[PDB]
Structures are given as structure tokens and as C-alpha cells.
């Protein structure tokens, strides 16, 4: 798990790249959580690239929009507009640690376990 | 000579002279426990007079764009004197009822309205998030509900409204409101008769339960017919429930209880 | 030691069998039953009960509670039709999600007598007559009142009784019908028409409602349990 | 909606600690995908805790879990200075929504 | 028994009024076709049976599809053993079978068919596995591990398959703590009080029982081989000896959680005229 | 301790036989003898008698 780059721009849409392994790509879900600091994580959503399938949060859910890419194993999340509390550092992790229960009677949960270095973006002038 | 009835339960009478009949519901009378089917082994309280006598809801408006409305047993009686008082005091209790609705109209109207009987009338949510709805809006009292016309999802995640989204051709529930007449059921068709009666035995899979915690029955109104009345702008009837509870008996007598309200 | 031969068919699961098997929670003390109201015994005491039909499947009168509802008027008399079925009590959109015919798509073959109740629900001083028919088929659906009487039909008028109750007697040249859109062995026609008009005094509404319910009368059956069409999962 | 945590706990060596996760029904309550998760300064949050009262591979058998109703409780047993940092609570809502709790600072005295 | 026979009817000329109702009343016309039209002497030999309700609940339906694996634990963190909480409300045809009506009580038999598969052959074979099935019931701790203490079932209840074998197959009484199973509970857990903080009091509208039946916990005796074999055992439940209490309409929607909720696939009539048939 | 009692006739012995072979009752097989039945309680639940060839209303 690789994050592309770090970025700053107050307003505009800042685009997030991450490449992981290419068994991972296909089994896992890959998730996105950000962290302000000081101010503890939040969940932001959830890509699968076996059927992309997407599930976003309330807080996050007209702004973010996220795909994927097969021929990089490369998944993207696009913050269309930012604003200042936006700065922040962002985690991508890979759900790949599975739970004892099944989820429902036919799915089985994972659990993040292998977390990338981050990207942090600045939203100031 | 069918048509006119005269109900008397305490001190409370019923006369009616447009009656269609009296339903008792799934042919069974209510009873009390017999000692063969009796859990609890405390002796019983049964009010009888203080508790079996009919009690008069709030009056709802029938008009046009009115959708149906719906109501809660033991809940509705819960503001409702010494029956109320018996309940909250009590931690078991067991009820029969006999439901009568009272809809009035001249010959020049037309409409009907479908009286439904449901035991265990669960109702759906307005939010994604499943079993969500709070106590405080799964029991209204004696005001009740509304149906609606259509399902309306609520957006809002910083203080959910958590309340039911009843939609009435889904019955509430799910289900096609045509095959909502399997419930014990009358209809009060305005040319036909003005009033339903509904004798509701206790139904439940115990021989007592909590009634603070669960509702044995649920009375839903639903327009079959709209009201309509001589081409004119407007036009507005009411309807009046009246309730009597029937084989009262309590069992674990404590403190009162006080239900949080908001 | 017993000599046993053991025969083809062994080591199978079939869904439908009726074997015994070995407990896994011996010496229980079951909770007795209690009296419950209502026990069924059997489907065929739910397929007698009256339940109403969607049969205004108009874009507009869809999915919301107008599809129930068929509105007749006070304009003069005409021999077009009010409502028509096509007697499919499954596979007719607007029967089989009725009680009967969410029955019958649990089964293959069906056999019996049907009921059909209209209640009018107009004013007491609104009166006319309808005529409600049953046409066996093999022959051109009626779209007049003049081929319509030639087949088993009931004249309702309108009074103090306010619904009237149409038996569809049971016409078939098979023991059972088929459950699905088959062209053997279909079912008829229904239809209904205006004897006369229906009649309004002034400061009365000229269009009124009527609602229509559907039975299984008490020589009902099916026979061969299948799964159904109407319900769904994804993923 | 933030499931919620006191801000900080403070032990000394040798002492045992709990820190306590309040959340709610649809939530802890109701499912058992209630997970614990480590974070020191400069790192990455690490997985401490998966199932209610299960361990990863290499976590050390110090760190203990329970859940009693609406509340889920992280129990260390035996302080030491390397566990000074960040400790963050993690459940599933029933809306198929992941929501994480607001984080608790642990100072070792 | 067979069904009553079709008495013959000649034409009528009187009083009597069969084909005139009211269903204000709430009552279904008991209407034979001797009342309407003129009828011949039938004699009827069919018979209700399979519209009987231990016919209609006689056919097992499938529940769960619960995965364990078989590999080394240190790698990749492979099931190696799960736990399913035992509902029926997950899987639609049996729960709309059984929400057909309100109560219910009945025995159960369960079937168990297991399958296997290798995710890649070339690392090498494996033998023949062995699965045990253990019940948890309601208070009875879970097992961390899979080999952990638990396994040993002292007390729980346990079903040890070996693979190629028919489909393991036990039966379980009535297990409910009522006098009948509720498939709809219109109420709530416990009942909040005044003064009592927000986060205190609040439970499920329609839950009842958390933890009402337990749970089932599925694991590979064997020790790891070098491949990586997955592993479905599929459950299959089968209602006998079946009594039912409540007549309820058939659900019309897709299903939406345990509850009677609904958010989509609304609408489901499709177009049809009123006067094309 | 052997039960006899009599099949289907259809395209048709007559009897058949079955014994019990465990000691609960949640063992035992589905005998599918049961032929009760009463719609009445669900197509009239009215207190007063209902004719058919009366008029309902009275
Ligand atoms: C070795 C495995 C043992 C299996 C034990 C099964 C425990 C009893 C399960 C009963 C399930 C009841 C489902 C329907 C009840 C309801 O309608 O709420």
C-alpha cells in the first residue's frame, strides 16, 4: 500500500492515487480514513475493486467519488470541492484481517490491518 | 332489528341504530386465565367495573387528502384512568377488547372507511438504520399516527427524527392493503351503516405479558372510499373511537412506572 | 451381522424426505402449548377470504390507493365495458397478488370454484343496476353487453344490500389448471357492464367508486408445492 | 455520531487501566465487530484487537477486551512505558456505515 | 376426506337472496354454485391434502452459507473458524413462508452439506478433512481460537463430519421460552424512564431476545497442509410437526434487515388496462 | 411396537409400516395425517348466526 503524493490548493478538487498488491486489489475492500490533528480518525468510505461496489459516508457523501483501476491495481478518491477544515492527513488500509461472525448468513467481515503512510493536504491560502 | 345494538360494559352504554353486525374476532370471547395455562403464581388483581368500561379517544377529521391513521392497544389506554394506573403500576397484565368506531354522515356522502384489526402491527422505520424507531414515537398515546402517501427518507444523521414512515397502500408493514382483510375487520361504508364494532380476544403467545413493553394489537383506519359531498370546495366528517378493555387481571404489583416522554 | 443389500438412492439428500434422525438436545422439557386463537390447519381456509383486487392498473392509478378503485359515472348508457379479467387467479397482474393468488404461485395446479364480490360505495340515494359476466373460453372476449349475455352472468341492482356476490362455477376440460399463462387450459373471461344507468338525484356526486373482492369457494384445492416469482435477493 | 471515550487516563508502572468505549444500540450493542486499534506519534493506527475479546498475531497478552451492553472496555493489565499513546475504538453500524470513536491519550506515570 | 359433492339445483323463483352480501359486515358469502347458476350431480374425489400446513412447511430451505478455511496461521489470517448466529430472516423464500402468519410453534431438522475447493492445486494435496459443527447456546462462551478449550464439548452439543459422508442431519425440539415462536413482536426490549440519560433505555423496536437461539461454530480438526483449502457448509432447515395461529398478508416488497422495513424496490404492480384483458 | 395404518391410493399394498426408533418426540417423522378444518372462524367471525339465503342486513 502506496500513497501518490502530497498536495495544497485552497477550493479546487484534489484527486488521491492508491497502488497496492495485485492480490489484494482483487480479494480486499480498500478503505479510506483521514485524520485532522489532534482531532482523532474518520471514516470517509469503502472501494471494492471485485465488483466496484461503493459505499460513502453521510458526511462525505456528495463530495467524494471514488474508482478503481485494473490494469495498475490502483484505486482513486476525488474530493470535488475543499474547504479549510479539509486539512488534513488521509490513510489508505486495506481490509484483509476477517472476523469469526459471519456477516449476515453469507458474507464474511474484514477489519483494516495493513495501513499505507498517509497523504496529508493542505487547505490554506 | 340487526341493525340496532346496545352495548353496556360498567358504567357505560353504546347505542347504535345503523349497525352492520359485530365482529368477534377469530370466533373467540375474551376470557380469563384458567389455572391449566396460569405462569405467574402470585394471585391476580381483576379491577372488573373500574377497568372494563369504554373509554373515548381523541376525535380525528376524515376529509380528501386524508391518508389513514393507526393506533396501539394497551398504548392508547394509557392515559386512560384507573386501567392506565393498573398498567403502569402492574408488571404483567392481559387484556380483551372491544373496539367501536363511530363515523356519522348524511345520505348525500359517499365513502367508506376499512376498519382492520392487526395483532402484532409492526410498522417500518423512516431511515436506512434497522429497529431504530425510539419508544417515545412507537407509542403515541391516544393521538396516534397518520399513514402517508409516500416514503420520504430521512437525510438528517445529527438528530434523526427516528419515527415510523407508514405508507398506507404498504400497510405500514410491507404488505398489499387488499390482503389486509385476512385481520379480523368491519368496513363503514357511509350509504351502508355509521358504525364497526371489533370484539378482540387476548392474542398473543403468552398467557401475560409486559403491556409496557408490547402491544397485542393494532387498529388501523384506511379510507377504501374518498369522502366526497355534492361537488362542492370542501367537506370534513369526524371519526370517534371508543375502547373498552375486557378481563383485566394484573399480576407483579411495584412502584410506578414513568415512561420517558420527549 | 445382519446381510444388508444397499440400494441406488442411498446416501442422497432429498429435500422432501421423511426420515427420522437423532436429537441433539435429549430430555427436553418442551413448554406446553396454550389455546392461541385462529390455529390454521390448512391454506385452503385463507383462500376462502375476501380480499380485494387491484384493478385499476392505469400509470397514474398504480401503486398508490386508486388502483383498487374503479369509478363509474352518471353519464348515459353505453355497451363498452367497465372492468375486464382475463381469469388467470395467478399470472393476471392484477389477481395474483391477491391472498388467492399469492396461494397459488406457491403451486402448479389449481381446481375449484371462485367468488367475486363488488361493493358498491356511492350514496345512499345513488341507484342503478350492472351486469357482471363469466365467459368460458374458446370464443371472441366480449366488448359489448349483447355477446356478454349469452354467458353465465348476474344481474346486481343496487339497494340496502350493498354488494352482490358472482360464483364462476367451475368449466374446465382438465381436472386441474395450470398455474401460469398457459393457452391450454385457460380460464374465461370477466367482465362488467351497465344494465340501465347508474342515477343520481341533484346535490349528489355524479362519480362513485366500486370495489371488487376475490374467493375460493369450499371445493377449492391445489396440489404440487412450487416457489414463487414474487420475492427476490440480491447479491 | 462519534462513539464516545474519555479524552485521558493516567497510571503508573505496574498499574492496571481500563479505557472505556461507550457507543449504542444498532452499534456495540447489538453487533460484535468491535475492534481496538493502537496509534503512536508519527505512525500508522495499528490493530490491537479485532473480535470483542481476541488478539492478533504479536500483540502482547497484556491487552485484554469485554463488552457488557452498549460498552466495550480495553484492559491493560501491567503498564509499561511503551504503551503511552493513542487508543482508538472501532465498531460497525448497522446502516453498513464504519464509525470510529474520538480517541483516548494514555500518559504513563 | 374428499371435499363435499356438487348437489344438483334447478331454476329458482323466490325470497331467498345467496348472490345479495354485504361485506360491511366483515363475514365471506358462503356461496356454492347451486346458489347462483343450475348445477348437475357431481361427485368430487379431491382432497386438501398437500394445502395442509405440515405440506406446505415440509421442504427444506437453505439458511447459511458459512466459509471456514484450512492453512498455516501465520500467513495471511485465514478462517480457520466461524461462528453464525442462528436466524432464519436472512435467506427470503422460508422467511416469507414463515411470515405467512404470526406464531408458530414447530421441531426442527437441520442438514448440513459440505463442499470443498483448492485455490491452486500446484502447491501440493491435501487428506480427507474432518468439520465439526458445535452449538452454542445463549451464555455459553465463544471460541477465540481453533484450538481453543472450548472444542472440547463437554456440554455443548457437537456434530463431527467427515468429508464424503452423507450430509450430517439432527433434530431439535421446541426450544422457544414462549408457548409459541413470535415471528413479529410489536414492541421493545425494556422501556425507557424519565430523569434516566439518553443513552440508557434504549433497545430494538422488534428485537426481543438479543441472543435468542445461540450460535453455531464450524472449524477444520486437522492441522494445516500446505495448500489452502476453502470450505462451505451450507445449512438447510426444515420445519415439523408444524402449528400455526395468525393469518398475515405475504410480504410485497424486498426485504430490508430483520425488521419490516423497506427502502427500495417499491412499486411492484405493472401496467395493465382496465378494460384490455 | 409396530404402527400400521393405510397410504395413498393413487395409482394403485394398502398399508404401510413404521416404527419409532428413538426415545424423543423431535425425532419421530411427519405423519401427515391431520384433516382438520374450520374457516368459519376466519370467513364468519359474526356473533349473530349468518343464512345465506336470508338478507344480511335485517
Ligand atoms: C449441533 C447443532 C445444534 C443446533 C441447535 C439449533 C437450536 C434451535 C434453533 C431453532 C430456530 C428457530 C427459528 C424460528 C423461530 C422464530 O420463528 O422466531
Known sequence: VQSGAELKKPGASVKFSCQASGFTFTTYDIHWVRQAPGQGLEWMGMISPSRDSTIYAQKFQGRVTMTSDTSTSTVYMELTSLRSEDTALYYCATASRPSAWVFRSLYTYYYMDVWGTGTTVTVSS | ??????????????????????????????????????????????????????????????????????????????????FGQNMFYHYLGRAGYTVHVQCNASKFHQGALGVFAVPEMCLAGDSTTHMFTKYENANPGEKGGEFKGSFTLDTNATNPARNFCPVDYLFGSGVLVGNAFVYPHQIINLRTNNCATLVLPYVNSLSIDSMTKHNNWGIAILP??????????????????????????????????????? | GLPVLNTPGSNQYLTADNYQSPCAIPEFDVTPPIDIPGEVRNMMELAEIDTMIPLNLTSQRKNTMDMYRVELSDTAHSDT?????????????????????????????????????????????????????????????????????????????????????????????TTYRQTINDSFTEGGYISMFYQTRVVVPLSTPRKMDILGFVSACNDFSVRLLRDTTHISQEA | SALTQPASVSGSPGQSITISCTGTITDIGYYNYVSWYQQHPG?????????????????????????????????????????????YCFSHRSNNIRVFGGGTKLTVL | ???????????????????????????????????????????????????????????????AIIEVDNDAPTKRASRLFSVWKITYKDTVQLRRKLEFFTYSRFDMEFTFVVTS???????????????????????????????????????????????????????????????????????????????????????????????????????????????????????????????????????????????????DGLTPLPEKGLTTY | GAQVSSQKVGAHTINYTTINYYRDSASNAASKQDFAQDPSKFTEPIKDVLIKTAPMLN
Open chain 2, 1 to 82: 332489528s340487526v341493525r340496532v345494538m346496545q352495548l353496556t360494559l360498567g358504567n357505560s352504554t353504546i347505542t347504535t341504530q345503523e349497525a352492520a353486525n359485530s365482529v368477534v374476532a377469530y370466533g373467540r370471547w375474551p376470557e380469563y386465565i384458567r389455572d391449566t395455562e396460569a405462569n405467574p403464581v402470585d394471585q391476580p388483581t381483576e379491577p372488573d367495573v373500574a377497568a372494563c368500561r369504554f373509554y373515548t379517544l381523541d376525535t380525528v377529521t376524515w376529509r380528501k387528502e386524508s391518508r389513514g391513521w393507526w393506533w396501539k392497544l394497551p398504548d392508547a389506554l394509557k392515559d386512560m384512568g384507573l
Open chain 2, 224 to 262: 377504501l372510499a374518498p369522502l366526497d359531498f355534492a361537488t362542492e370546495s370542501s367537506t370534513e366528517i369526524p371519526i370517534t373511537l371508543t375502547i373498552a378493555p375486557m378481563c383485566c387481571e394484573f399480576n407483579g404489583l411495584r412502584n410506578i412506572t414513568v415512561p420517558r416522554t420527549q
Open chain 3, 81 to 173: 365495458p367497465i372492468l375486464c379479467l382475463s381469469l388467470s387467479p395467478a399470472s393476471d397482474p392484477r389477481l395474483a397478488h391477491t391472498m388467492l393468488g399469492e396461494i397459488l404461485n406457491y403451486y402448479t395446479h389449481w381446481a375449484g370454484s371462485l367468488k367475486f364480490t363488488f361493493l358498491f360505495c356511492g350514496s345512499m340515494m345513488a341507484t342503478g343496476k350492472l351486469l357482471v359476466s363469466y365467459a368460458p373460453p374458446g370464443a371472441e372476449a366480449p366488448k359489448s353487453r349483447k355477446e356478454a349475455m349469452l354467458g353465465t352472468h348476474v344481474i346486481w341492482d343496487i339497494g340496502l344490500q350493498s354488494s352482490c356476490t358472482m360464483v364462476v362455477p367451475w368449466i374446465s376440460n
Open chain 4, 43 to 87: 505512525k500508522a493506527p495499528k490493530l490491537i484487537i479485532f473480535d470483542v475479546t481476541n488478539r492478533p498475531s504479536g500483540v502482547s497478552d497484556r491487552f485484554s477486551g469485554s463488552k457488557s451492553g452498549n460498552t466495550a472496555s480495553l484492559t491493560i493489565s501491567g503498564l509499561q512505558a511503551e504503551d503511552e499513546g493513542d487508543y
Open chain 5, 1 to 63: 376426506n374428499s371435499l363435499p359433492d356438487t348437489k344438483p339445483s334447478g331454476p329458482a323463483h323466490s325470497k331467498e337472496i345467496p348472490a345479495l352480501t354485504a361485506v360491511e359486515t366483515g363475514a365471506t358469502n358462503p356461496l356454492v354454485p347451486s346458489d347462483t347458476v343450475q348445477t348437475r350431480h357431481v361427485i368430487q374425489r379431491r382432497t386438501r391434502s398437500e394445502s395442509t400446513v405440515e405440506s406446505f412447511f415440509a421442504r427444506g430451505a437453505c439458511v
Open chain 5, 117 to 263: 475447493n483448492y485455490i491452486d492445486a500446484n502447491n501440493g494435496h491435501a487428506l480427507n478433512q474432518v468439520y465439526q459443527i458445535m452449538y452454542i447456546p445463549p451464555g455459553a462462551p465463544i471460541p477465540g481460537k481453533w484450538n481453543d478449550y472450548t472444542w472440547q464439548t463437554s456440554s455443548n452439543p457437537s456434530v463431527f463430519y467427515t468429508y464424503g459422508a452423507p450430509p450430517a442431519r439432527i433434530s431439535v425440539p421446541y426450544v422457544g421460552i414462549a408457548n409459541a415462536y413470535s415471528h413479529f413482536y410489536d414492541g421493545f426490549a425494556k422501556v425507557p424512564l424519565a430523569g434516566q440519560a439518553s443513552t440508557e433505555g434504549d433497545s430494538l423496536y422488534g428485537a426481543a431476545s438479543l441472543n435468542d437461539f445461540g450460535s453455531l461454530a464450524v472449524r477444520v480438526v486437522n492441522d494445516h497442509n500446505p495448500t489452502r483449502l476453502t470450505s462451505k457448509i451450507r445449512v438447510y432447515m426444515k420445519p415439523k410437526h408444524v402449528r400455526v395461529w395468525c393469518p398475515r398478508p405475504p410480504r410485497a416488497v424486498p426485504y430490508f434487515g430483520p425488521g419490516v422495513d423497506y427502502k
